[PDB]
Amino acid sequence: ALESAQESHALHHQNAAALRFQFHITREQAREIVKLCPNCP
């Protein structure tokens, strides 16, 4: 699930709430993707 969440944010750069519910991942997991994303400060 997290594998598809990561590459989906790379396409749309949605917020952590969208990554958390759509792909069923932890809050700290979804928040980490946004920080780790270079296009999302």
Binding site for a second copy (CB under 8 A): 4, 8, 10-15, 17-18, 21, 37-40
Residue 13 assigned to a binding site: yes
Round to the nearest angstrom and report the end-to-end CA distance of the chain.
Answer: 24
Residue 12 assigned to a binding site: no
Residue 17: which of Zn ion, a second copy, none does it interact with, CB under 5 to 8 A by kind?
a second copy
Instruction: Tell me the closest approach of the beta carbon of residue 27 to a second copy, in angstroms.
Output: 10
Residue 40 assigned to a binding site: yes
The two tokens of residue 26 are 């932890």
DSSP assignments along 6-18, one per residue: HHHHHHH---HHH
